[PDB]
From a paper:
In this manuscript, we determined the structure of [name]-bound [name] coupled to Gαiβ1γ2 heterotrimer by cryo-EM at 3.15 Å resolution. The structure shows that one [name] binds one [name] homodimer and one Gi heterotrimer. Because no lipid was supplemented into the protein during the expression and purification, there is no notable lipid ligand in the 7-TM bundle of [name], which is different from the previous structural discoveries on S1PRs. The TM of one protomer of [name] homodimer interacts with the TM4 of [name]. Structural analysis shows that residues V41, V45, V48, V49, T52, I56, I59, A60 of [name] mediate its extensive interactions with the receptor. Residues L1604.42, F1614.43, I1644.46, W1684.50, V1694.51, L1724.54, I1734.55, G1764.58, I1794.61 and M1804.62 of [name]-TM4 contribute to the interaction with [name].
Cluster of Differentiation 69 ([name]) is an endogenous negative regulator of lymphocyte egress that interacts with [name] in cis to facilitate internalization and degradation of the receptor. [name], a type II transmembrane C-type lectin protein, intrinsically inhibits the function of [name] in T and B cells. A disulfide-bond in the extracellular domain links [name] as a homodimer.
Numbering used by the authors:
A (entry chain F): 40 to 64
B (entry chain G): 40 to 66
C (entry chain D): 5 to 62
D (entry chain E): 2 to 120, 124 to 235
E (entry chain B): 4 to 55, 182 to 235, 240 to 354
F (entry chain C): 4 to 340
G (entry chain A): 20 to 37, 46 to 239, 250 to 325
Amino acid sequence: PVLCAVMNVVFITILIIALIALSVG
Amino acid sequence: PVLCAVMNVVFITILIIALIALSVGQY
Amino acid sequence: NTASIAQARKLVEQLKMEANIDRIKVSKAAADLMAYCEAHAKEDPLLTPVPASENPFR
Amino acid sequence: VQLVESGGGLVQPGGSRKLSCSASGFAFSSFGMHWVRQAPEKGLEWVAYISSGSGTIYYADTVKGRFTISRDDPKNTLFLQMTSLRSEDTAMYYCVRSIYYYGSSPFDFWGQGTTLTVSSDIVMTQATSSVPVTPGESVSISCRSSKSLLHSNGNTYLYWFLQRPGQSPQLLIYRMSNLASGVPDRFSGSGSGTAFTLTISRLEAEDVGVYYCMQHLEYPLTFGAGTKLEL
Amino acid sequence: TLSAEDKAAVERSKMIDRNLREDGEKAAREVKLLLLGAGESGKSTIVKQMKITGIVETHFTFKDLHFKMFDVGAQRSERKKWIHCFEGVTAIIFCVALSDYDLVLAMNRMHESMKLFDSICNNKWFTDTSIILFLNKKDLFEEKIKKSPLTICYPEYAGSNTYEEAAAYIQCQFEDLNKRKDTKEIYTHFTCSTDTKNVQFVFDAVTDVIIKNNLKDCGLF
Amino acid sequence: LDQLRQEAEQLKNQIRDARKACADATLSQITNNIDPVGRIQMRTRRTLRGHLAKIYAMHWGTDSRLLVSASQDGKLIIWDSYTTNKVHAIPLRSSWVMTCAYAPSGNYVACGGLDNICSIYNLKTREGNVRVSRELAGHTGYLSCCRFLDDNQIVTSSGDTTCALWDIETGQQTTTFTGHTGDVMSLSLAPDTRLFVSGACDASAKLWDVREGMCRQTFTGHESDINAICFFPNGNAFATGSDDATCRLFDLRADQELMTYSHDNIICGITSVSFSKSGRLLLAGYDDFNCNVWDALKADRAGVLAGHDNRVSCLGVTDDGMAVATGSWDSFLKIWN
Amino acid sequence: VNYDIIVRHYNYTGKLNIKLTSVVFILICCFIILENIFVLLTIWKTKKFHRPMYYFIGNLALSDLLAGVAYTANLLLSGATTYKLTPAQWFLREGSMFVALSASVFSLLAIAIERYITMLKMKLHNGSNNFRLFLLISACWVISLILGGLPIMGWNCISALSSCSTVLPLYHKHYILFCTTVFTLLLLSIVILYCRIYSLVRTRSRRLTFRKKSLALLKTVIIVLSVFIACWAPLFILLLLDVGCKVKTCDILFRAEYFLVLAVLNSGTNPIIYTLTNKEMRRAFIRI
């Protein structure tokens, strides 16, 4: 659905944020 | 469609595995 | 008038036709209904759930 | 119902040509359209297919890249833009109507054909290219496939066509048992996966011709070698 | 895992889905109006105002709105058996003859119109569908009240028998027949068989109903 | 006049006395040693999306696979219930459709509604589209139900307080069944198609003869109008659905009511009834968005098929009894077993 | 990157040490949490299961719930006891609070955008347009997460000490001016959108002409804009006077906990407005 698409987008986004956070950490 | 969805799933798995590797190893 | 008598006697003849019918006993009628329901109970895919092998709707 | 093709003639090897079939008498935008060709002394052979709405296009492996199929729905025309012709590429090109839904009869109507002269798959096998006929029999021919045509739906996508001498091929039986609208009850189909049989009863004329068995399980749709019967 | 024919069947199904969605989007931008009112109420004048048995469908257009009017008074059946087919209309045009305040069916035609309006305005299906009340025969009502009193229809009436305040009294009666005032609105108009402001009034009332519907849609109302 | 009225009163009392004289024991007193059907669990196997308005009727094909459904967006859609494909989508000339019917041979569909005409669409044409074969006009009220006898005869029921038997080839009524006093809301054909019953808006179902045109019997007992009616598969009993939250099972040979299917929890009208294949189950669609599954011999169930978000306006079982399809005003057909 | 950096940063701000404000703030905050749960379950409790105009009140309720839980996490872990936290945990806490508030403001903008689009296109029958719900809600959550994670992704004050904000020690100052600029842009966009909605409704209702409201809309618009400005703009002017003044002379700061609790009170009073003004869902909200 659309809620699940938004959920996948926010999950991949928080994953990229964690990835850059480890890249600086 | 289905090819873009499979590519997105593969990219999500690659990001998760890269995060797991950067958590195990270091830079 | 004329239409009143026409409608009244139409109802009268219709009920005369409806009253001269052979009635069987309600016990016999319900016995026939339950005999039909028991004779065909195996071929009822909603009564007895059919296995998913031969169920066309999975 | 009319399918009339145009664009034939003679072409030197190489180059280009455009075949066009004008459709009249049916809802052209609802039917998928096929191009099948027939060499001068050979059987039928599938060439191309465009869906309804042009959303799906297939070609034969001996044709892909050189040809282009296209349809013009408001003009009720079907086009075959063929480039880089070869000497083997000469044939009579038929335009074939085909509609696909549950219980439909695709390949039911065929065009008249235009002669064109040039100066892994499923193998369908016919028994013998000729069957003798003496008055007072009931002929029964066979067509053995090289793959189980019985899909998991229960359908068995094998068709039977009739081509009268100097005529266009006519659908007889679709999905191996369902006889098309307008054919007598003489023609009957039977068999199993990889084994099929067309049974004719009560011998008469008008059934003289070459009988082709086509499969429709997957593309490309491969015909059979044809089976002539004469007397 | 589908065969060669099943894929083409699914493709035909998807084209059919596409045409159904196109037809739905085309039929969603069209006002659906329902004409009601007793016989000889002058709704023939209203269906003639457009100037561009069973149910009768009148398609007319205006300043960027396509209207469809459904004259249902032709068929006589139990109205409660098919009135739920119109529970999604935009408005309800209700024609009432002002000149029928003294005529009798042998009862009173104005009372029959009021009973029908009471039955339709407070129906459980049109619980928020607004009503566009037309009051036809205003000039005939002028001459009739110039000759005959209004007390024959409303004995409880006590005002002076003149056109303006008696017309206001009739409108007040019809609007007081509205049990549900929080959800629906009644846009009264004193039409005649002469002028062409009727389509303008229908357009204005439908535009107001569209504004209220959008306000209720996006939370505000 | 008074002699005719008193004669009708005495004759109604004679009919009532004859109906009481044959009621030796009720159906509960005789179907008491029957082990119950247990709990009937049905799940939505299919959900057919594509209608954009309230679905008003449906009808299965005789091959138990193809549907037809009429909604008030002006579309007759013919589904392939096994794969949810839409075989055809017929645009109606009048979007106010209240019924549909699939011919027993599969060649035709029919539909009608507030336009008073019963249009008959030809499905298997040579030019590959579905075109109106006939428009049967002659009713003066809305057409509420229609069933095919064969490819040439269709019987309709309208709000003219009358039913009629048409000849499709000519286009004119060969028989008009009169005798009701309210809007005829539904009919149901016999398995041998020699008789049919019709339920009207006067709380009475009448058993008609197709070849003769006369009303054989009349069945009273409902407190309100009858919105739906179906036959027991045996052909000599039928169930009626009324607006007083009550199904009743009448019998043709006993000429009276056998059993009433009601529940104190249920206060909403009934829009559609249908028996199962063996007749043991009596499905009934209600106004409270549900679809209760009654035991036709015990009358002791409410086995809910709750899947809809609006009034279940139509339902029907397949000819092989394999599935139950219910259509509702929420524009979705669901298929149950 | 040890604790010495957070200690020396607090030394750079002078917030070093060595209250009932916490208990009243957690009272206000659990009130916010409970009303958020109420307004969020009400969407699930009713038949609003599809409701494409809804899910926006749901997103606002969800982000307000996250603002509540983030304010609990901040208040329980703030004060002189904060020194036991690592820079990672500190960045995590502050970024959580910022992503909560930014998600609230962006969801409010999404509500205003959907309302303006619905008001512009008259759209006689209800329109779903799920392709736009995805874009709006995903943009809300993604941009809020970006603004909350910009500190933890390196853009911070661990490199140069001169850019230190005395309200948030480890935070970069240019990041704070950028975040408050984005907040001001969102505020201006929301007010412009609602004023244009009112203009559209007023002119369209004025064009009509019949004898037998628009001012009822002005009440809703003015109370929405009023609570939004009155409970968010103090933080805007606070951070503006922080960034645009000399260092260590802004003694009127250090009471930002009251500013933070009023800014989260904004989020907490949003759902009571968006469920009391909407009578359709107030019908669904029968009792507590």
